[PDB]
Symmetry: C6
Subunit: 206 residues, 6 copies
């Protein structure tokens, strides 16, 4: 967590920025990171010992938790943040290597190289948008809606009876889920707007 390094990396100013992209996208990314960290360290936490089921035979609780919860929300959000951040750092090191090549040249074709850099930036933005969309889809597929069930009836082996049990903190997890979904949706909208602005600028150049 550094103030100087985070701006030089997450913003992704690169060749050109629309003042509707890197700034707002970086703001939403930082908000998402902070909310995810708070959710992971505090409310989900261990999220395995807290889930307790009314049974005496050992191992029923563990297998039941995996049956009802295949992959936790925090894992999905962390994976999504990593995947979304990947194109930004990609273009950041790409620009660093481009400036290294420029300083090597110091020690027509350059215009073409810069144009290729612009194309890489555009395709990176598109890939980030697709990653966000597919992560929203997989989140919808794994969990319907937004609310979290409180009581679950368990029948898997080795649970000898249809015991019922409870989730750790339903309401806090619901609130944080709503926050994360809203932030991701705003990020998708901002990315689409940035792509449209880039298309408008390209048409204006022509």
């Amino acid at each position: 967590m550094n103030w100087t390094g985070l701006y030089t990396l997450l913003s992704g100013v690169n060749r050109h920025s629309t003042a509707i992209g890197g700034v707002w996208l970086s703001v939403i990314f930082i908000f998402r990171i902070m909310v995810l960290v708070v959710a992971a360290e505090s409310v989900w936490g261990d999220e395995k010992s807290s889930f307790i089921c009314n049974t005496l035979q050992p191992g029923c609780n563990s297998v039941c938790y995996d049956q009802f919860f295949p992959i936790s929300h925090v894992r999905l959000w962390s994976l999504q943040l990593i995947l979304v951040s990947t194109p930004a750092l990609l273009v950041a090191m790409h620009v660093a290597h481009q400036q290294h090549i420029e300083k090597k040249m110091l020690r027509r074709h350059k215009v073409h190289i810069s144009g290729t850099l612009w194309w890489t930036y555009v395709i990176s933005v598109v890939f980030r948008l697709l990653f966000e969309a597919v992560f929203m889809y997989v989140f919808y597929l794994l969990y319907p809606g937004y609310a979290m069930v409180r009581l679950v009836k368990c029948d898997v082996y080795p649970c000898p009876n249809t015991v019922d049990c409870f989730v750790s903190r339903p309401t806090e997890k619901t609130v944080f889920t709503v926050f994360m979904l809203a932030a991701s949706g705003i990020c998708i909208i901002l990315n689409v707007a940035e792509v449209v602005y880039l298309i408008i600028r390209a048409c204006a150049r022509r």
Copy 2:
């Protein structure tokens, strides 16, 4: 936690400051951050195992805690701090992008752009004030007053009898709640004063 980066970000000097805003607001923000960190790591802590209820049937304690405590105070305070900090970092990266545009121009309209930056700063201050007010309202709605109840009578399923149980540390949580509320109220007052000072300056310009 860095001395140099925190001032360049939290202060939000931006286009102009009234010497009644960024300095005092940043001081109160740092105090709030430190108090929240101390409260989270030390007194609330896990805040789930400590809450113990006089019952033998497993799962009664967990569901009872969620019934009485929907969302913990620490979660509300952390969410409020993130939401309040969001406009400050927003204007910080906005000014960074503006200076990037300025250095690009180096490599009438500028006055208009700077005026738009000033308007963005003003609207960011207003949004921060509204966020603080709505967080105070939701805190009041969730918990009446400031003191924390010590003994709670539990009747939810699967608690077979109306067992009664106790909170971990009532007095320390009460003190920290009072501290957090007082700091937030002072922050709201300071924000309102800054808005009034900005209005006075704008009228003086006219």
Copy 3:
């Protein structure tokens, strides 16, 4: 924890220093911070599971601990450190904003502004002294003397019998309490000496 940032902030050199103030006060502050960190992470630690009472009915131990210990020593010391540090960072960001105003002016009244800065520094020192004194008073009020009781007789509900129980580590806590009190007293003496020196300098100016 940074060497460069801590000196530029905790020293509070500001407009003027007496070479009896910021240096010695910063030294005692750093010593207090280190001792408090050592006490919190190591000896008090969790300070809730360690406190064990001879009872079988659950919840007796928890409520008994709050009855005998309303607010822990570590919480009081951390609160005192935050409150004492608040004026120092206050004047630090105040001087940062003053130098920002100076660089803006670069891009009679200045003497008056600097005098107001000096007055703010003086009033900040006074407020720090008052905070230290009131924290010493509240520490005395909550706990008489310095030694820590070892055996406590508990009679609160739901403890069915007058069971007796023991504190985790009496002697280490006693030693750290003595250290913290001595450091705070030395800090108060140093602050009073600095105020007297400032008064002497002001009279010398007149």
Copy 4:
């Protein structure tokens, strides 16, 4: 975790880069590091207490876990990351020492020394590729395929009966295993492409 230091070390720009190597390889390395950290701290975690087996005789669970799981996936991935990172930091300190020798010379043969540096870079890339390949092979040898078994029948001493027991989180571990394997395969492909590009450049020089 620093933005400035990580680029100057992991990129391995060295004597020359193909703009297909250090940038993409560093991106995949950072992604692998983040995924491994998330997997270690969150999903595998302790990975010993979570593995619970239906037995009452103590020590059966512990020895059974080692029988079925000789070395954990997280340990293999961390070892692989360290081994792969070793040549990169090797060439980084090698270039630092080369520039130290250059500044000493400041205070024909130089061309030969630079050529030897280029050869060291090439052999380092080859060694990194071999390390990646051998780690993939050992991962395949230890665990067949990618899916993780859920129920295991245990017969080792001192487990008096053929008790059966369950893994902590099969599906999350499966997903993270797939992620890690895909990232490593992409890294191997990129390394092979970089070696081929270096061979093409060498032939072009001749």
Copy 5:
């Protein structure tokens, strides 16, 4: 933990150094810090749950541990390190304030001020030596010799019978105790040598 800041602070070069002082003393101080950190986080650790006694009545183990171990070795070593480090940071901020006064003068008496700084450095070295000696004495007083007892017979209330119990890790603690004592003794010898060298230099000046 920073490379640049630690040298500028712990060395205490100040007005003058004998090349037998700050360098070797800083080396031994860093070694002591590392050994203490390793001992605290790893071998002593919690050092309360590990100490287990053969009794069923609760609270016997806790009070027995305090009876036999008044203050832990790690606490004594950390206190000694803080107290020894205090004069070094004292003279460091003193020199910082002196250079601030010098830059203020830029914006006979100076020789006298520098001589007073030299006297402060000498008295700080003496105080560090006295602190080291008194800490060695208190360590000897609290624990005779160096070896750690393994079996202790406990008779304090509320232990109804003279139960006997065992320390967590005798041999590792013995080794680390020997390391810490040897390092402290070497530090005392080095401080005495530095004082003697300073006296010799002062006589040479006369």
Copy 6:
């Protein structure tokens, strides 16, 4: 963990380097540090609760663990790393003080001082080699060979019967032991080669 500081300290470039020493030795040192950290935090971990023995009388397990394991492998490796790092930081602060003396001189004998610095570097290298060798010897003395026993028969008091019990993770510890031993052996070979190269250079000078 900083990229800039670690190179300026661990490399130990000092007066002169053979390009066979500081670079390769620093690489192996960094690898050893990373492997030790991974081994400590993950596989050995607590290494006390995991060791479980088939007994009901409390205290048998604890004393039995100390009987079979006097000092853990992780403690030996950490001690060895600290002892080996001590000469490197020694010469680093020595060179810092030498350059301070040089800047003081700026504000025949110098050749002799530089020669003494070279001799200090040589003797530091020799001491590092001796420390590595003696640590290998003590590791061999404490544990024969490399494999870790799985089942141990315990007969010490207060274990009323010759109960047998198991180590936590034999195979992972075996692998990490082999890694650590191989890295240390390579480091010894590199140190011997550096000493021989220094002798060859000294003879070449004569």
